[PDB]
């Protein structure tokens, strides 16, 4: 018994953007206020945690464009 | 018995966008307030949580196009 | 017994947007207040959370287009 | 007297194709059988000529898009 | 007696093509046979000619578009 | 009396393609015979010619896209 597998996608995508100007931007949010209050934190096994946080973020990409792409062959036996 | 697999996807695809101009854009929210308490925090097994959070975003990319593919051929005995 | 499979599947999609300008948004909500009061958090066994969150997000993508393919061939015995 | 001539054609013309895939061709002719005879040749001056010719032929071009032009002013006295 | 000739054409064409695959093409032609008899053969000035030729020809371009022009500003006295 | 040529034609022309693969192609003629008989051949000027030829071609380009111009101004007394 013979097992023959041929592995050959092909792709020519493109992910593209055109612009003529950004032009004015402007981020002025108010003075935001973040109280808060705990008694005790235990933390185990794999656990990710934020508290507390206040983020300001102007995040102006030119382009900004993502391709993702993922191949996986298995085999077994 | 022969097992012949031929996997030979094909893609030309094309995600894009043209834009004049982004033009002005004014990000000004009043002042928020978040208050959170609590009195015990137990975490295990790969759980993530987020408390108190306060977030002012302004994001403007002049293209933000995406693509995403996944490709999988699984084979057993 | 053989087995013969071929999988060629085959696309010159486009997925595209043409505009002129973006012309001018004004993000402004009121000063918003959240207020969570609990008194314990146990978590297990991949649970995620959010708690307390206050929000402003003004996105202005210039395309905003995207694309999701995903492809899969599976085989047993 | 004065004379003015002002050629300013403008061409944004596009000649173009899509094609999903080619597929199976099969130029498969049976085998033909030329004979001539003639006793003599004089030829002069710009002729040209094809004698005993047996021609196979497979053209498969992907797009195969054409275009011509011919801009001609011409001026006298 | 003033002359003027403003010879500007302006070209933005384009000739283009997409394909996904050109696949399998098989040129299998039974065997011809091309005979030819002449006494003489007496050639002058711009001639050309081709006698008993047998051509096999496959011809499988990925695009195969063309794209042909010819100005001609001409002028006298 | 004065004479003025502007000779200022503008190209922004493309020819172009995409392919996403060539694929098997399989030239296999049948054997081909060529038989030719002739007693005298005189030429004389610019004759150009062939006799008794067997050609078998396979020409797979990638491209294969061709472009041709000739500008010609031409000027007299």
Excluded at 1 to 30: A, E, R
Excluded at 51 to 73: A, F, Q, R, W, Y
Aim: with cysteine; proline share 4%.
């Amino acid at each position: 018994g013979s097992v023959q597998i041929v592995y050959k996608p092909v792709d020519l995508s493109k992910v593209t953007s055109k612009c003529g100007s950004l032009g004015n931007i402007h981020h002025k949010p108010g003075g935001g206020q973040v109280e808060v209050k705990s008694e005790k934190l235990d933390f185990k096994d794999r656990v990710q945690s934020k508290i507390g946080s206040l983020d300001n973020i102007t995040h102006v990409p030119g382009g900004g464009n993502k391709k993702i792409e993922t191949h996986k062959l298995t085999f077994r036996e």
